[PDB]
Amino acid sequence: STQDADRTLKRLQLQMDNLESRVALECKEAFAELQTDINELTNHVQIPFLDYRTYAVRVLFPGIEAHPVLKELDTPPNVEKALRLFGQLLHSRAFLLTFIHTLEAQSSFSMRDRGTVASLTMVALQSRLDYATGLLKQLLADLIEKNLESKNHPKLLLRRTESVAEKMLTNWFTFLLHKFLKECAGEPLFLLYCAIKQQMEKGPIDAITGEARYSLSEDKLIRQQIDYKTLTLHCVCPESEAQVPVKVLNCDSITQAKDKLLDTVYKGIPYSQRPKAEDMDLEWRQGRMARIILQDEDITTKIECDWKRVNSLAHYQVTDGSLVALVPKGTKLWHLVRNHVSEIYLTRLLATKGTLQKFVDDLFETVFSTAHRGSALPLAIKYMFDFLDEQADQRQISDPDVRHTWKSNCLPLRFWVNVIKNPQFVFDIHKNSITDACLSVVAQTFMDSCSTSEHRLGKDSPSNKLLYAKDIPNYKSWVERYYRDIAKMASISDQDMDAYLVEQSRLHANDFNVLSALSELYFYVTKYRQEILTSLDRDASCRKHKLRQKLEQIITLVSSS
């Protein structure tokens, strides 16, 4: 670099050091405050883990509610008969290898399809993970061989390929790391979620733009002056008709108020079991003289020149200590911000960052731990990392950055990043917009920590890179030491791994509707009928077991009546 470049880098670094100093001690006390807030709402309430099958489907099939895989599949007799024969073809190594490779060779087979097939296949094989794991390794070996002989960059492997195999590997980790979540990593993940959520609610949150006073995200940082006050509402408990205190802000929209009330009044109950804010009316008991109900929008909402403001608690002049109850029930809207970085905001981000730091450190540390709180490294991780090492060794590939990159690409950069961004895949919780925004910043820092690539700090650098510039180097060392420690461990024998996989398959054998998964998967058989059949006819091993004739029978059987 140039002397100028180095000069401006050093200035930016001390400029950062300066703003960090302004907030350092304040952050320490803010954290302690958050931690006692946290140990209250949860330390005496059970972490709301989803059950395995719900978690699995949330991850494997993102955003799909009531996936067929979790429910009955009433189907014609000939259809079920055909599907069961298809299911058995999936237990043929030669068939499944050929099936997947054929699909991927098709240009109409999209990235979306690749994920769909990867998820359906792993669900269908959930009861036979020992078999599945053998097939997965072959697929990965096939992918690695192909790419290294297409003569592509080693490090560039398992990154952009986005193969069915890589997606199946992610699903494989998803199945086999649930215990680790339950026992070790789930807690710090959940606590980070709670910390972020709680911290955001300490200040104004715009119900329309999703911006927040205390945003960890520069993009969602409220950039205007917002005066506000902390109110305490006393909510009539849905029991004695008994009451509880809830902290809210005067600027909070009525829905936000209702959601805050719900969170406290139902603090023990998992989210999906609570009533919805929109199915309740907030009623203000200044009575028994008067019981008046508040909403985001009613006859009193303020409208000015085509702008319509969401009603807040302050709109109704709700007073601190007010009694309250939750009872079953061409225009531009705005809430706090109406639209027709500087030091002050950089320091605000830094205060939030500093306040949440410990929760982030806890998560990253346990994700990259080999012997956490007495527990042991999950077998799936040692097994797969050893496999990757073997694949590297097969080619004399000694360069540490290669296997480091493969391991990062395969595990933390897919599985972990995904649950960090989406804790609601693991827990029965609601992740709101501002929380999602903060988690995105955390996920990016996490991603950066897994890279061997250098961190080039500059003004044009993303906020996360700037905020966490001093933390990344430490995190990177944790990751390096993680891979190192795992490699030193004793290899898991094939018999031991198989026994483990058999036990996992047994535990969850009936968690999913395999027939439903089979029917969904069969869609691709018919869309690429001709290509598949041709491949089965061409491949020598496929003929050995007359896979072509078997598929033909299935295709016919499903039509018959």
Q: Phi/psi at 521 (nearest 5 deg)?
A: -65, -40
Report residue 376 as tokens. 């042991």
Residue 471's SS3 state is coil
Per residue, the 3-state secondary structure of 128-169, as one string, reads: HHHHHHHHHHHHHHHHHHHHHHCCCCCCCCCCCCCCHHHHHH
Query: What was the experiment behind these coordinates?
Result: X-ray
Tell me the chain's radius of gyration from C-alpha atoms: 27
What is the 3-state secondary structure of 299-333?
Answer: CCCCEECCEEECCECCCCCCCCCCEEEEEECCCEE
As a three-state string, the secondary structure of 346-412 is: HHHHHHHHHHHHHHHHHHHHHHCCCCHHHCCCCHHHHHHHHHHHHHHHCCCCCCHHHHHHHHHHHCH
Tokens of 316: 């109704």
From residue 315, give the alpha-carbon distance in Å to each of 152, 294, 309.
Answer: 62, 10, 10
| Token code pair at residue 8 | 């401006």
Residue 198: CB atoms within 10 A of its CB come to 17
Report the SS3 class of residue 203.
coil
CA torsion through residues 168, 170, 176, 178, sign: negative
User: Edge-to-edge strand order for the sheet containing 303-304?
Assistant: 303-304, 307-309, 332-334
Domain covering 228-339 in this structure, CATH number: 3.10.20.90
CA contacts within 13 A on the Cβ side of 326:
29
* CA–centroid distance for 401 within its chain: 26
Q: CA 257 from chain center: how many Å?
A: 27
387 within 8 A of 380, measured Cβ to Cβ: no
Distance CA 114, CA 165 (A): 9
* CA–CA gap between residue 12 and residue 530 (Å, rounded): 61
Environment class of residue 25 by beta-carbon count within 10 Å: exposed (0-12), middle (13-18) or buried (19+)? exposed
Which long-range contacts link 478-482 to residues 24+ away (Cβ below 8 Å)?
A: 478/364, 478/365, 478/368, 478/449, 479/368, 479/404, 479/408, 479/412, 479/449, 479/450, 480/404, 481/368, 482/368, 482/369, 482/370
- For 245, the 3-state DSSP assignment is strand
Contact between 169 and 119 under an 8 Å Cβ cutoff? The reply is no
For residues 27 and 30, what is the distance between their CA atoms, to the nearest angstrom?
A: 5
Paired tokens of 364: 């990253």
CATH superfamily of 1-227+341-561: GTPase Activation - p120gap; domain 1 (1.10.506.10)
Resolution expressed in Å: 2.0
Q: Max alpha carbon distance in the chain (Å)?
A: 87
For the chain, give every domain's residue range.
1-227+341-561, 228-339
DSSP string, 204-238: -B-TTT--BTT-SSGGGB--S-----EEEEEEEPT
